[PDB]
Structures are given as C-alpha cells and as structure tokens.
Enzyme design. Structure first.
Site, PDB file in Angstrom:
ATOM      1  N   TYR A 209       0.868  -1.257   0.038  1.00 22.05           N
ATOM      2  CA  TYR A 209       0.094   0.062  -0.172  1.00 22.05           C
ATOM      3  C   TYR A 209       0.840   1.218  -0.012  1.00 22.05           C
ATOM      4  CZ  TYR A 209      -4.260   2.860   0.739  1.00 22.05           C
ATOM      5  OH  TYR A 209      -5.325   3.752   0.833  1.00 22.05           O
ATOM      6  N   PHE A 274      -6.151   9.207  -3.096  1.00 21.62           N
ATOM      7  CA  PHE A 274      -4.727   8.542  -3.936  1.00 21.62           C
ATOM      8  C   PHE A 274      -4.635   7.371  -3.143  1.00 21.62           C
ATOM      9  CE2 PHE A 274      -0.626   8.402  -5.511  1.00 21.62           C
ATOM     10  CZ  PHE A 274       0.211   7.774  -4.573  1.00 21.62           C
ATOM     11  N   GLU A 275      -4.325   6.211  -3.846  1.00 25.90           N
ATOM     12  CA  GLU A 275      -3.695   5.042  -3.096  1.00 25.90           C
ATOM     13  C   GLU A 275      -3.158   4.263  -4.343  1.00 25.90           C
ATOM     14  OE1 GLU A 275      -6.910   2.851  -0.974  1.00 25.90           O
ATOM     15  OE2 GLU A 275      -8.150   3.034  -2.826  1.00 25.90           O
ATOM     16  N   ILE A 276      -2.243   3.607  -3.792  1.00 18.84           N
ATOM     17  CA  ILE A 276      -1.519   2.646  -4.658  1.00 18.84           C
ATOM     18  C   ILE A 276      -1.714   1.323  -3.789  1.00 18.84           C
ATOM     19  CG2 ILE A 276       0.685   1.652  -5.782  1.00 18.84           C
ATOM     20  CD1 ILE A 276       0.061   4.403  -6.782  1.00 18.84           C
ATOM     21  N   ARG A 311     -10.455   0.823   4.583  1.00 20.09           N
ATOM     22  CA  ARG A 311      -9.259   0.259   4.156  1.00 20.09           C
ATOM     23  C   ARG A 311      -8.262   0.339   5.175  1.00 20.09           C
ATOM     24  NH1 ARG A 311     -10.595  -0.589  -0.222  1.00 20.09           N
ATOM     25  NH2 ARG A 311      -9.984   1.178  -1.643  1.00 20.09           N
TER      26      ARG A 311
END
Ligand SMILES: [Ca+2]
Ligand SMILES: [Ca+2]
Ligand SMILES: [Ca+2]
Length: 387
Positions: A209, A274-276, A311
């Site tokens: 993450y 925003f998230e990876i 999350r």
C-alpha cells in the site's frame, strides 16, 4: 499467535495510546506540526533503494497494474485534468493502462474525450458496474436507512460508492487481470516527476500500500465502525499482524474527542482519493472476511462508513505496517490538502506549483493531519530512512 503476544495486542487495542488528561492537545498539535515539518522540509528526491526500475528498463511497464478511476460521465473534464497531470509527472514514461469504472453506462463522448487526450498507444478500458455490485443490497432495511439519513442531515450513491470502493472494486472483471491499482480521482494535482516504476517499486520492496496523505475522519460518519471492528478482531485474532499499525489507530492525543466519540479509534486513515494498492491484500482472507462482516453490520448504509477508514483499519490491523509506504516524493493535491515535498536546491523534479510542506492553506484544518502520528509510530526503521 503466542497467547502473550496476542494478549498484548488486545490490550493495546482496548486502551488509548496516551493516558487520558496527561497531555494538552494544543501542545500535541504543535509538536506534531513540527515533526511533520521536519520531514516535509527535508530534501528528498526518490526512494533510497537498490532496485528502482527506470523508464525503458526491461521491467518498466511490466507490473500487472492499472490506473483506476471511478467516474460518472459528467466527470470527464475533471478526470482529464488529473490524467494529464499523472501522465506529465509519471505515466508518460511508463505507459500503464487506465481502467475507468462507472455505475452507469459510459457514453461514447466520454470515451472519445478520454482517448483524445492520451497517446494513441495508451490502453484504456471502460467498464460498467453491475447493479447488484453497486446498489444497496436487500439485507438493508430501506426505511431504517431513510430514518438514519434523515437524522444525519444522504445521496444513496455516495453510500454505494464508499461500499464499492471498500469491498467490490477489486472484484470487477476488468481488474481480475491486475495485481496493482493506482487510484485516481477527478480534479487532483501532481507536482513532481517520478522517474521509477511505482508498481515495480511496490513489488520489489514488498509494499502492499502507498499513500501520500493521512488524516482524521469525521467521527459521526463512523460511530460503530471501530466497536464492530474490535469484535471482528476478537473473533479472528489470527488475522492480526503482530506489527500492525496499532498505535496510529489509538492515538488520542491530538483529537481526543474523535477517539471518545468512536470509543477507541483515532479516526486516522489514509486519504484514499490517492492510493497505490496491491490487490492481493484486498483479495486475501482477512480483508474479504472483514468486508463481509461490515456488509452484515449494514454500517455502509445505516452510518456513513467511508472506504478510507475501512481500508485503513484493515491495513492497520491485518498487515505489517512496514509494508505500508508513504510516498513522500509524490507531490499531490486534492482540495483541501497537499503533500508537497522539498527538493535539493538544484533540482527541477517538482514543478514549483506547491509550497513545500504546506499541508493546507487553512490553518484551522491543521488538526486534521495525522501524518505525525504515522511518522512517530508507524514508520519502520526502513521507511524512516527511505528518502
Ligand atoms: Ca492483558
Ligand atoms: Ca474487546
Ligand atoms: Ca468484544
């Protein structure tokens, strides 16, 4: 887990990080601004790791990854703005595809508008979300919903979205082929060039993450999320990771009211616009079981449970925190917050459209920043020296 290690985690999850009334939140806020500032004003450029994949290296562009946008047709221009910035600061050199999802059918003009602003060889896919994977399920009592949402003032579709982004997006057929997503929202900014393959960076250094901003939530949206989550964890203690980000969850020192309101949760969360994300984690048993349990509680509808705290809870509890990466180098803005790193003096990596270290222009929001807690308690020995 060894009973002692487990017991010690349970104890930590049932008590505040700092004993009630041993701290003044205003001093904590200042100290925290200072800690944040030390990191933000540090000159950085990119992760200090060995394995970075450059543009045109053999591994560049080879992760199974996509940039993912959940959009309505009317978002076209705003998502284009974000896309152009993403391309300019990163993806023009790596060429990852875009996946767009919508709860309604995409129009041809949406699609052509998107295609017209991307290189001809950029791969884009557009997918509808089946009504049964979006809509309020039967298990929800609608009049109970209507009652709770009457008090709470809402758009049903916002509830659907939160739920969708918590527990469903990664099951969409178009995403079955991907391990990684870079979630992109409309109307964001990117400020700084990223000259390594982000997904490959994740894969090579075991990060599941990546985030850029880390915030307090509105406690009234998530009244029983934490308490329900505590009961879930007590039924599945084996899902806990011994190096979970437990202190981050329990930091009551900056916003003790948020902690009291939720009866044990800081409300700190990764700001998921925003998230990876490594989808293996979301597809794993602990995450899937947690989602099914929250589905059964109904809080996505009876309360206003955002994908972000959901999350974040799952990441904090069920994974090693050292596998959660703060992308300090990704200069990023979505109203009203900005992650704006500092460059060495001779560097043109950042485009100069953000003020280094200026989290928000409205100082009243300063206490919504949870990054200091993350720095102080959640960053592993590796993460702390990684930039
Ligand atoms: Ca005990
Ligand atoms: Ca308990
Ligand atoms: Ca309990």
């Amino acid at each position: 887990h060894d009973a002692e290690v487990l017991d010690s985690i349970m104890d930590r999850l049932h008590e505040p990080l700092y004993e009630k009334d041993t701290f003044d939140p205003n001093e904590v806020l200042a100290e925290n601004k200072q800690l944040y500032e030390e990191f933000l004003l540090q000159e950085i450029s990119e992760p200090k790791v060995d394995n970075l994949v450059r543009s045109g290296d053999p591994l560049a562009g080879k992760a199974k990854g996509t940039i993912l946008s959940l959009v309505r047709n009317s978002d076209l221009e705003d998502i284009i703005s974000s896309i152009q910035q993403l391309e300019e600061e990163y993806n023009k050199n790596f060429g990852y595809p875009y996946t767009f999802l919508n709860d309604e059918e995409f129009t041809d003009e949406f699609k052509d508008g998107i295609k017209s602003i991307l290189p001809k060889d950029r791969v884009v896919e557009f997918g509808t979300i089946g009504p049964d994977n979006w809509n309020m399920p039967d298990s929800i009592d609608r009049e109970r919903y209507d009652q709770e949402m009457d008090k709470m003032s809402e758009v049903e579709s916002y509830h659907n979205m939160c739920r969708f982004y918590s527990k469903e997006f990664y099951h969409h057929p178009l995403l079955s082929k991907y391990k990684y997503v870079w979630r992109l929202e409309p109307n964001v900014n990117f400020y700084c060039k990223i000259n390594y393959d982000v997904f490959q960076f994740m894969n090579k250094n075991d990060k599941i993450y990546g985030f850029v901003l880390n915030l307090y939530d509105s406690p009234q949206t998530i009244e029983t999320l934490w308490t329900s989550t505590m009961d879930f964890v007590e039924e599945h203690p084996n899902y806990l990771n011994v190096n979970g980000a437990f202190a981050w969850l329990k930091d009551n020192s900056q916003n003790p009211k948020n902690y009291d309101y939720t009866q044990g949760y800081s409300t700190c969360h990764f700001w998921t616009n925003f998230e990876i994300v490594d989808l293996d984690f979301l597809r794993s048993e602990p995450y899937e079981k947690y989602m099914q349990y929250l589905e059964e509680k109904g809080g996505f509808y009876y309360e206003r449970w955002g994908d972000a705290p959901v999350r974040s809870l799952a990441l904090a509890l069920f994974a090693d925190k050292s596998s959660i990466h703060w992308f300090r180098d990704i200069g990023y803005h979505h109203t009203p917050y900005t992650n704006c790193p500092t460059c060495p003096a001779d560097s043109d990596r950042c485009n100069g459209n953000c003020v280094p270290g200026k989290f928000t222009p409205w100082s009243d929001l300063d206490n919504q920043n949870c990054q200091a807690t993350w720095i102080r308690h959640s960053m592993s020995e590796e993460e702390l020296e990684m930039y």
